């Protein structure tokens, strides 16, 4: 019956079944999902099976200065039109099939390490094209609610940085995973830390700190050493601009405690100029590749002390048994010093 | 053709701008834009006499791009 | 590329305030914003 037919919107809303108790709580899963297709897309007004040529609708109205008359394509000429439209339909589908793949993160199914691009431009014509965003954790949090039972939300942790010492992180929360990305990356750019770098490639000194139950021990390293650190630390270090560093994470391996613990330790590192100003002495760098040549790295801006720094025969500094055990050749691990890809 | 009171001269310069846009957005744009010599000289003169000197100075490049002889009156103004 | 067609300005802007309106709407016709 003609009067029982419905519009394309009504038919797709029914066939797709996007509203319903299945789609309310995700009670139904979709390995095979009906996909909406626009059937008016490649359709030309005036074109029908019979192949009639209507002047002014599907063919030009005037031909050679005279009005065209009603005509019909030959059986052969119409088969070509039908065949050409079928090929155009596979070509359209083939173009949609050709979608650029994105690189994976720490693993194929992991969100960690994936770039989200630069933060969105702020309302007042502000732009952050120089900043890159990396995901550190994507979690599904489930909240029990008074009337709606278990509800599913997303908590995302992202870090941002420009590669020149300015970097930050922020948590994002939303019901949709892409809204959490927007909130986290946009908020993080307003909570940027500045991280001082020695020669713009490493940290100024060994950093050992604990944040809650997460311990992080970082070691200053020379050029070419690379980033031999927890994969999340590697990601953050590329955003800060650190090229050479060793880090070891102990205790709880909580991504959030690790992230904010790392920024706390990198923001409280004393530079060589600060040490020289604090002690009013020269800071002299001795490099074995340069032999006994003394290289002054920082000199105090104020007066220069005349009294040598006291030489305590033995320093009362606390040592890490892990560092000492390695220097004495007593550290045996099959997992240490393994060959890995450039980081 | 001739100079006019400031009120009229401003009106003639608002039209010359709209005509200039017509030359710039022709549907023969696929073919090289044909900017007659008289049109370029007149459009430039109308901007000067209206006080839109910034627009007139910019147009001088189009005399070299299209290789159109500038008019003596335009150079003196 | 052919320019997209531009809708003309409403002919109400050409109407004089002392016109003969019955000539605009001589017979029953639907409301036309461009004509009223």
């Amino acid at each position: 019956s003609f009067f029982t037919k419905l519009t394309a919107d009504e038919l797709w809303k029914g066939a797709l079944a996007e509203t319903g108790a299945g789609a309310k709580k995700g009670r139904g899963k979709r390995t095979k999902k009906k996909k909406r297709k626009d059937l008016n897309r490649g359709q030309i007004i005036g074109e029908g099976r019979y192949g009639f040529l209507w002047p002014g609708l599907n063919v030009p109205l005037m031909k050679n200065g005279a009005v065209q008359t009603i005509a019909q394509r030959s059986k052969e000429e119409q088969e070509k039109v039908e065949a050409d439209m079928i090929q155009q339909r596979e070509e359209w589908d083939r173009k949609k099939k050709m979608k650029v793949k994105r690189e994976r993160g720490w693993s194929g199914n992991s969100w960690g390490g994936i770039s989200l691009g630069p933060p969105d431009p702020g309302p007042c014509g502000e732009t952050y094209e120089d900043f890159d965003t990396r995901i550190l954790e994507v979690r599904n949090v489930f909240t029990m609610t008074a009337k709606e039972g278990r509800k599913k939300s997303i908590r995302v942790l992202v870090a941002v940085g420009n590669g020149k010492g300015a970097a930050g992180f922020s948590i994002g929360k939303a019901t949709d995973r892409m809204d959490a990305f927007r909130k986290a990356k946009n908020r993080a750019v307003h909570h940027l830390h500045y991280i001082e770098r020695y020669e713009d490639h490493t940290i100024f000194h060994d950093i050992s700190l604990r944040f809650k139950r997460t311990h992080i021990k970082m070691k200053k390293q020379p050029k070419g050493y690379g980033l031999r650190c927890h994969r999340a630390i590697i990601t953050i270090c590329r955003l800060i601009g650190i090229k050479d560093m060793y880090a070891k994470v102990s205790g709880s391996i909580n991504m959030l405690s690790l992230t904010q613990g790392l920024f706390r330790g990198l923001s409280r590192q004393e530079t060589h100029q600060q040490l020289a100003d604090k002690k009013g002495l020269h800071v002299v760098e001795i490099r074995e590749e340069c032999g006994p040549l003394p290289i002054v790295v920082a000199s105090p801006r104020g007066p220069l002390r005349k009294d040598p720094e006291p030489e305590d025969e033995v320093p009362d500094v606390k040592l890490d048994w892990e560092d000492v055990k390695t220097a004495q050749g007593m550290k045996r691990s099959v997992w240490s010093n393994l060959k890995r890809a450039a980081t | 053709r001739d100079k006019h009171p400031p009120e009229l001269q401003v009106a003639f310069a608002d039209c010359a701008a709209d005509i200039k846009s017509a030359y710039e957005s022709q549907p023969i744009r696929q073919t090289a834009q044909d900017w007659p010599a008289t049109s370029l000289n007149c459009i430039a003169i109308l901007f000067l006499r209206a006080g839109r000197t910034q627009e007139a100075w910019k147009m001088l490049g189009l005399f070299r791009k299209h290789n159109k002889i500038p008019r003596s009156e335009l150079l003196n103004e | 590329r052919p320019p997209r067609r531009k809708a003309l300005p409403p002919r109400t802007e050409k109407m004089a305030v002392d016109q003969d309106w019955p000539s605009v709407y001589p017979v029953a016709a639907p409301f036309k914003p461009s004509a009223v």
Binding site: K96, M98, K99, V100, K101, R102, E103, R104, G108, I114 | S25, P27 | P2, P3, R4, R5, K6, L8
Partner: peptide, 16 residues
Amino acid sequence: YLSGEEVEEYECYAPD
């Protein structure tokens, strides 16, 4: 997401 997401002027009176 890693597969890819590809959902993918002048006006004239009496145009031609």
